[PDB]
Amino acid sequence: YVDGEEEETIMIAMTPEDLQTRSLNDTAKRIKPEMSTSSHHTFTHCEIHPSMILGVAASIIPFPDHNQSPRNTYQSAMGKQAMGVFLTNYNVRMDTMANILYYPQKPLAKTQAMEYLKFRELPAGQNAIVAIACYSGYNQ
Amino acid sequence: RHGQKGTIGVTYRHEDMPFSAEGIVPDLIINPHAIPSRMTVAHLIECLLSKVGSIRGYEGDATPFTDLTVDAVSNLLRDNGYQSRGFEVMYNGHTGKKLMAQVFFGPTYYQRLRHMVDDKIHARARGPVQVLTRQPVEGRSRDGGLRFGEMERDCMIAHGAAGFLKERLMEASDAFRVHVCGICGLMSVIANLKKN
Amino acid sequence: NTPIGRDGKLAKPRQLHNTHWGLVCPAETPEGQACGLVKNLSLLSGISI
Amino acid sequence: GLDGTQVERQTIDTIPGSDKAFHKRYYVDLMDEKNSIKPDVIEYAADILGDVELQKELNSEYEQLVSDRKFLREIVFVNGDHNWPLPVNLRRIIQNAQQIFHLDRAKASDLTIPEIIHGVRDLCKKLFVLRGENELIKEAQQNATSLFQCLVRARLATRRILEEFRLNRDAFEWVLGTIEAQFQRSLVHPGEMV
Amino acid sequence: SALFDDIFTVQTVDNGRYNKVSRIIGISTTNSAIKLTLDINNEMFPVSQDDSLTVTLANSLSLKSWRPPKPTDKSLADDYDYVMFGTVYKFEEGDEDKIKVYVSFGGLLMCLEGGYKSLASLKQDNLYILIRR
Amino acid sequence: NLMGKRVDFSARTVISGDPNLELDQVGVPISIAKTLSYPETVTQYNIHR
Amino acid sequence: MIIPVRCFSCGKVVGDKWDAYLRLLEEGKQEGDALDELKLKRYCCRRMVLTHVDLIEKFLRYNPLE
Amino acid sequence: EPKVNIINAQDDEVELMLSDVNLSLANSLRRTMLAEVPTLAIDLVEIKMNTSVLADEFISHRLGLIPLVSEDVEEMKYSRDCTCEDYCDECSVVLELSARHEGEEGTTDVYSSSLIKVSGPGNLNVGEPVRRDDYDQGILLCKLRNHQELNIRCIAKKGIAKEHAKWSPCSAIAFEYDPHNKLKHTDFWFEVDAKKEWPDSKYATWEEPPKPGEVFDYKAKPNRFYMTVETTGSLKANQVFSRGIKTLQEKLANVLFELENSR
Amino acid sequence: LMDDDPVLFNRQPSLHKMSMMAHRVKVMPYSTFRLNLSVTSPYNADFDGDEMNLHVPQSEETRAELSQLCAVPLQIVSPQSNKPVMGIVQDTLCGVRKMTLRDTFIEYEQVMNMLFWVPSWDGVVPQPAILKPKPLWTGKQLLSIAIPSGIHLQRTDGGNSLLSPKDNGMLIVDGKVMFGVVDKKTVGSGGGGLIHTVMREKGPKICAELFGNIQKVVNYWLLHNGFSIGIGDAIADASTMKEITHAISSAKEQVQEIIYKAQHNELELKPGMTLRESFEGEVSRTLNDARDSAGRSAEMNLKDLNNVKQMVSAGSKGSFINIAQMSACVGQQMVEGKRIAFGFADRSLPHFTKDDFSPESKGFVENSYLRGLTPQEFFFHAMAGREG
Amino acid sequence: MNAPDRFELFILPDDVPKLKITPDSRVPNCIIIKFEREDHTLANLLREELALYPDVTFVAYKVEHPLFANFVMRLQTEEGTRPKQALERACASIINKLKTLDHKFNEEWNIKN
Amino acid sequence: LETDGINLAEVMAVPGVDSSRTYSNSFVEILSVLGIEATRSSLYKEILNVIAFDGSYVNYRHMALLVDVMTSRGYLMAITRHGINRADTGALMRCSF
Amino acid sequence: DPTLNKTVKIRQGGYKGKIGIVKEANGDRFRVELHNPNKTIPIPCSF
RNA sequence: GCCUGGUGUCUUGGGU
Ligand SMILES: [Mg+2]
Ligand SMILES: [Zn+2]
Ligand SMILES: [Zn+2]
Ligand SMILES: [Zn+2]
């Protein structure tokens, strides 16, 4: 375990693959940084997985590394307002307000962190078939 | 799940929707202009990935910071008989004529938020007033009235609609009649109207 | 929760500081008056007992 | 005295260009035949050349235009900007007059020169912002419309009316009436909470 | 019964911008300095370079609300392949004999260059253009 | 309460767009239209109506 | 909650195929192949069975309130 | 002059080619089959007891979606057009369901096969919940555990899909024409080469490709429309195509009637 | 409340006078307020959850005040900047560019419907642009039906000639479009455009019909042409990426040279600036010019049919920088007007060594949103985003 | 709460005619036909049929608002023919084509049975 | 030349400097050196520069109206309580701010 | 009036066979609060 | 046989 103060004095590799130098030109995939200011790096630690920097709410977003940053903030707010099934014992609790979606579905695009949030077991939404189109102008 | 939120603008029955050649109709049509300035490219990739996922029968792994690329997903999709970028030819429902443009089409996870119109709609003719000010009460739950604030006052001045502004703030609210003394100007008059 | 207020504008307690990496979420924060002052623990965070 | 909704950027054509290009556009010489008005655009072309009495008006016209250009370039718009928000857009009014009366044609015009010079000069006294005969009001009324009068005179110059826009008698009297009516309509209304 | 008639050799056919429109430039076989620039619909009337085209300009097809043509009546257009209708939007009374006539066929543009003696009758409100072969 | 105040004959709801309405129109829900009212004076020309 | 009677998007009945789908998974078939055997060819119908979550098995565990 | 060539056929779907008609007629046939071909469907559920874990209208909602045999529905009247007092034998079918779990263990699954027809316009073959085989239990409605009971009475009525989608006899209707785009009604999106990047129609081999020289026939019209009508079993596929045409006829007939009566 | 009663409509916050305009009621089913789309701009309204307020005048005197002073058509031109505040927007504006392209042709059967869709149409079908071998109208002719007669407007874009090779500029004669694609420069809210001109020549009543006429034609036509966007439209081809990757690679080298010069005392000092200010200033100018150069390369490679390009070119949503960031390079992240600060001791993140002033260390996001951001870049992007 | 009854799409109120013909006197021989409780389904079918007749010079329709199941058609014919009569002709043609079409399907169906 | 810091009076007198055109962005100092009418033009120039910078354009009469209010008393009346409520306007009007 | 608040069944019209409660019985036209959709309808007494 | 009153002050969480 390291806290914020000890983190100041260590050198962290981002993934296990960065611990060793390599031998690409695939025009679709992303460029990895060159890292040519220091000739040889002496790593002391390695991240377990970099996606764990996100919290509970942002972990529901598929592909957050492809979004403009305010959209991840906006979804992190709206995700807490989405009807699903908040507990399995809703019939015996008498809460002031409760909402249960009729037919929850688990999402077709999931993340690994959702296994532990139980999102596939208590999902909060449905897979709609969506066309992105201008149709009658009633969707401007 | 990408900050792309909206309200329903209209509903259409099954036969008026555009359809693909397989007879699949969308549940839901969002607008193309929501994408380029908001730059939620992840929304498109999720649609592409989920298309592949439902054909081959698994849930794609969309964890951030992995080796998955758009081209790898596109290769799988074309090998299943669909155009590789997710487009499909579609037909106008009113006429049966093809649309000159092809339409990005596929599953996307959508979430139902708590804000529903019948929890917000409100109207007041006359109704209950506050004991202290004899002005309309505050709040939907009490049959309240909307607040005509300081900024709305200024707009009517700019329009020069002086007559309208007077009526709003008197006849349509808390108008009251008082008696004053012509000599001392105070509201100290004792007025018995049946004794005159 | 950081109990600084709504009095006092500026930016320093509201900004996402570099040292938040891996300890509080960089994305999850409320809109409005509490923006940047209320934060949320990253998934692998712990608190010393 | 104008309402903000009623003005549009218009170019004031006496400001840019060299003195030579200016002179080429505005000057009428009733002596030198090759620097006069072309003969195919007027019917009365014969009774024009040599007339010293008609040349006194056209000299006074050009002298007026020289005053304006000197005043505007040295006092009002020192940096040379010649596109400015101004009331009632004359360019649109003229090209509408060209459509109503079918002002195509090489059909020489029956519109005489003294009608033009006296017509335009009389117009600039009817652009009433303030009414009343008091001496101070007339000075204020003249001051309020100084920039706009220069704009009008820069467009309704003798050569342009005859060579470029090609107005006849019916159309030109209509143009004057429209300018007069639309300028009044562009005054701010009393009571406006500006 | 027509206002202008000539035969043109196509020098260039620019596609580039559009899939269904090409710009053509031509010069009269019988009289140089008479030039024709014309946009045309590729798919309806495909043209190649060096093609010979008879171009007629009329102000009427008779030998206001458009109706589908009856097969029984007959007009000038029965003998041509490609007919367009348009608006004259500029009549250039130019230098010595440089005359240009700009016409717009619903945004399909034409410039006709030539001399006064060949084009004086073209000062019209509307024009048909008829193209043969 | 004096520079601004709550007022009668007002209504509020979520808005939607409609291209098949004129520029100066507003579509008003039926339920709102039955709650709001206008006091029209009775004259010889509208008494039957 | 429980398997929907109809596919939302196209209307084909899918509420009679849920039991058949669970049995095929015990025999080791992969999800794509199981859907193929049931003749659910359009991907609108496939999402319905592949992504449904059966919560009714959990709600029944709460010992009846009469 | 209209011609039909049936490519494949079975009980619940007919694939067919339609030719020598106008595009508008092929489309109106598509819409009519989805929206206006009458069927029978549950439209009123009287719950006398429901102690299951599902909410009352949740169960009722599933009931409305159960497809019923609607073969003889043309002789049946709409409820809104019947001269009788409340319901009767001429305008409704009554169904009943009763399930219960005895035993302290296990789960009783309530299936659509437990729906028992109680009355109905005899002896018309209408109102039975559709079955694939005879050993097919059908559609899952609910699940019951010890002491939980479900006892409901359902009223089924004639209706059309314009009112509510549960009355639709079709599911999808596949529909396409001109697989090689000779008419040029679409302009294909491409990155490099349009032909390699767009997949072939499943009817590409039923028409011949455009020749490499061939000029554009600006007079050609759409003329061959391939469509497949799938049904839910509430009606057989041949009936849906026939009654779609029949229903569309009366609608045009009704228009024709009104013109010769308004003079 | 009944049809054509005037009511005052209002959205908070009421920042200027066109936050309160008088509309005519039309009673309709369903529980939302309906607005014609061209009034969303003055209210700064959209339909993502916004609510609006309605006020009903209660007497004969105030009804007349509403209709004769506050009514929507009187408000088309605002005194703020002597120009309109309402124009054709979003779908209708995107679609009207596509429809008025030089090569849009419409057969007879569809033309008849479109004419009938115009409420103000005089019943005279205009002659087709092509008579033989098949009657075809151009898009510009049918749009011209919606413009009233007697309207003249001329505008020159980039010194174009009357033969307009690029199909730019605009020329309108007697209410008929001679040439020119109709886009944001003509039917947008800019001063001197179409809407402003009809207002001066015909008055507010006619000008209000102009919005309705244009919308009804274009939305019909666009319904039958269709329009979409997909993941394909963000993807530049493999040849262009190598150009893109080279320009970013060469920019990182120049930043290395600047670091070398500044650390070897060979850097020119800018007037009024210390060494570190001058150093930071030169690096920032280099990196923003690098992204724009890379963005320009990505833009030019996109074909005319590419759907992203059509919206940028119409002006209906998006701009040059959006093509750049989706396809080429997100670019430099800024906080408080400066590059990312050393919030750890002498470094920006614990994954870098100290005293590292390279592009990747201080917040240059090399990847596009399409390619996906690396974990280091991601956090820096979230810092800049939070500040906004 | 403000949703209209869905059955109002096809059930005609008693005081409302299914069909209403009015003249357009601005041009000769032109009628406006208002169809109540009908859709694109009916309208598009009639429209194309009519357009192929030689004596119909103009035919068009619009569904003015999808929330109301009506549409209005405009029909102009040349001087000889009366528009309303021409509409009857278009109707009978399509009834005949569908009768034929129903027959040919039945025959082909038994062969595959 | 452009300077950091101000001393308008002393810099104007320096030989070489065009003493008829020197300008300062502190209009408080302009008022002490050049008088109230010069302040009007300087106030307008500084406001216009702010608005026009992000490409916006506001018609002249609105900014002109604001600076005439700010200079009508002969000194600069700030748009704060210390300026606005030092007017001879009625007490009900003044107390509402 | 003796039939307010008593349960009612409708025997003619589009709502034939539905349960309801008499909410208001001013004259000839009743107000039935239908059970089945959340709506209260105006209805004639013959029904 | 017409009239017909149900709270406040905060705090917190949200919407644009
Ligand atoms: Mg909003
Ligand atoms: Zn007294
Ligand atoms: Zn499906
Ligand atoms: Zn019956």
From TrEMBL, chain B:
Transmembrane segments: none annotated. This is DNA-directed RNA polymerase subunit beta. Belongs to the RNA polymerase beta chain family. It is found in: Nucleus. DNA-dependent RNA polymerase catalyzes the transcription of DNA into RNA using the four ribonucleoside triphosphates as substrates. Zn(2+) 2 binds at residue 184. The chain holds residues 983 to 1178 of 1227 of the full protein. Zn(2+) 1 binds at residues 181, 184. Component of the RNA polymerase II (Pol II) complex consisting of 12 subunits.
Automatic annotation (TrEMBL), chain E:
Keywords: Nucleus. One of its GO terms (cellular component) is RNA polymerase I complex. DNA-dependent RNA polymerase catalyzes the transcription of DNA into RNA using the four ribonucleoside triphosphates as substrates. Common component of RNA polymerases I, II and III which synthesize ribosomal RNA precursors, mRNA precursors and many functional non-coding RNAs, and small RNAs, such as 5S rRNA and tRNAs, respectively. InterPro entries: NA-bd_OB-fold, RPABC3. It comes from Komagataella phaffii (strain GS115 / ATCC 20864) (Yeast). PANTHER family: DNA-DIRECTED RNA POLYMERASES I, II, AND III SUBUNIT RPABC3. GO terms for biological process: termination of RNA polymerase I transcription; termination of RNA polymerase III transcription; transcription elongation by RNA polymerase I; transcription elongation by RNA polymerase II; transcription initiation at RNA polymerase I promoter; transcription initiation at RNA polymerase II promoter; transcription initiation at RNA polymerase III promoter; tRNA transcription by RNA polymerase III. One of its GO terms (molecular function) is DNA-directed RNA polymerase activity. Pfam families: RNA_pol_Rpb8 (PF03870). It comes from the Eukaryota. The keyword Nucleus applies. Its main location: nucleus. Signal peptide: none annotated. This is DNA-directed RNA polymerases I, II, and III subunit RPABC3. The keyword Nucleus applies. It is found in: Nucleus. Belongs to the eukaryotic RPB8 RNA polymerase subunit family.
From TrEMBL, chain F:
Coiled coil: none annotated. It comes from the Eukaryota. It is found in: Nucleus. Belongs to the RNA polymerase beta' chain family. DNA-dependent RNA polymerase catalyzes the transcription of DNA into RNA using the four ribonucleoside triphosphates as substrates. This is DNA-directed RNA polymerase subunit. It comes from Komagataella phaffii (strain GS115 / ATCC 20864) (Yeast). The lineage of its organism: Eukaryota, Fungi, Dikarya, Ascomycota, Saccharomycotina.
UniProtKB/TrEMBL annotation, chain J:
Gene3D superfamilies: RNA polymerase, RBP11-like subunit. This is RNA polymerase II subunit B12.5. Residues 30-102 form the DNA-directed RNA polymerase RBP11-like dimerisation domain. HAMAP family: RNApol_arch_Rpo11. Belongs to the archaeal Rpo11/eukaryotic RPB11/RPC19 RNA polymerase subunit family. The keyword Nucleus applies. It is found in: Nucleus. One of its GO terms (molecular function) is RNA-directed RNA polymerase activity. GO terms for biological process: termination of RNA polymerase II transcription; transcription elongation by RNA polymerase II; transcription initiation at RNA polymerase II promoter. GO terms for cellular component: RNA polymerase II, core complex. Keywords: DNA-directed RNA polymerase, Nucleus, Transcription. Pfam families: RNA_pol_L_2 (PF13656). The keyword Acyltransferase does not apply.
